[PDB]
């Protein structure tokens, strides 16, 4: 059934969904640019991914 996390599973199951999510919050942002909460969410998602991608590529 379940196997360890790899670089591939990290990209597939964390980084890709989170990027899709960013796309979606960006739409919710284009309805009311400057809505703080949504903009905050894009910042947190974006940080999350760069940290995880750094970790995956062992930088």
């Amino acid at each position: 059934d379940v196997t360890d996390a790899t670089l591939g599973s990290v990209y597939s199951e964390i980084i890709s969904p989170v990027k899709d999510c960013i796309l979606t919050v960006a739409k919710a942002v284009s309805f009311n640019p400057g809505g703080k909460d949504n903009t905050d969410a894009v910042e947190v998602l974006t940080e999350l991914n760069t940290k995880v991608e750094r970790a995956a590529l062992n930088q």
């Binding site: 379940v2 199951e13 969904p17 949504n38 062992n58």
Partner: protein, 188 residues
């Protein structure tokens, strides 16, 4: 760009996930709250993967352990077990500890699972795989060998040995478990 992940990488990723979940505006909006749950589910998926590392390894190795066993005079044996409190995932552990007899022993796993299928309770039945010495087996002819409620031969074991410390699985309706040793069992 190696595929295998070190503990430190796994830790760094988990931290990123905790931090993102703990500080995001996920309780400020219906949209955001739903995104909050998605994240918790992402972190969850990931912890399920790393949590499973060791069982996955033991699974990938079990083929190897088997081929070694054949060629060193060992085999995996299957012992049918019964409990009065079969729902208590804890009352099983205390029975496995008292193995070192009258329970039915099978050479083929397909046969012991078939026999379990017939049982009425199905919650009171389990079995353990066990590595045996194969010199430990008292080999009866098919003309002599005891048979189960289907016409399937059972194995008989020589005296005062086979108190073997290598279980390798515990099968039940709840699922496949593992002897911790530890005297407890769990797996997922």
């Amino acid at each position: 760009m190696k595929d295998q992940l070190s503990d430190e990488q796994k830790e760094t990723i988990l931290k990123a996930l905790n931090d993102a979940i703990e500080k995001g505006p996920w309780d400020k909006s219906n949209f955001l709250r739903v995104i909050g749950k998605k994240l918790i589910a992402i972190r969850d998926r990931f912890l399920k993967r790393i949590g499973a590392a060791s069982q996955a390894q033991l699974q990938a190795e079990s083929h190897l352990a088997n081929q070694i066993a054949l060629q060193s005079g060992q085999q995996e044996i299957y012992v049918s077990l019964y409990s009065s409190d079969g729902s208590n995932l804890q009352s099983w552990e205390k029975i496995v500890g008292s193995l070192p007899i009258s329970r039915p022993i099978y050479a083929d796993e397909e046969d012991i699972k078939a026999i379990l299928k017939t049982k009425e309770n199905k919650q009171n039945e389990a079995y353990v795989a066990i590595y045996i010495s194969q010199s430990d087996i008292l080999h009866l002819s098919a003309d002599k060998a005891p048979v189960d409620k289907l016409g399937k031969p059972l194995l008989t074991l020589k005296d005062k040995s086979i108190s073997l410390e290598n279980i390798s699985r515990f099968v039940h309706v709840s699922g496949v478990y593992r002897y911790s040793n530890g005297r407890l069992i769990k797996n997922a």
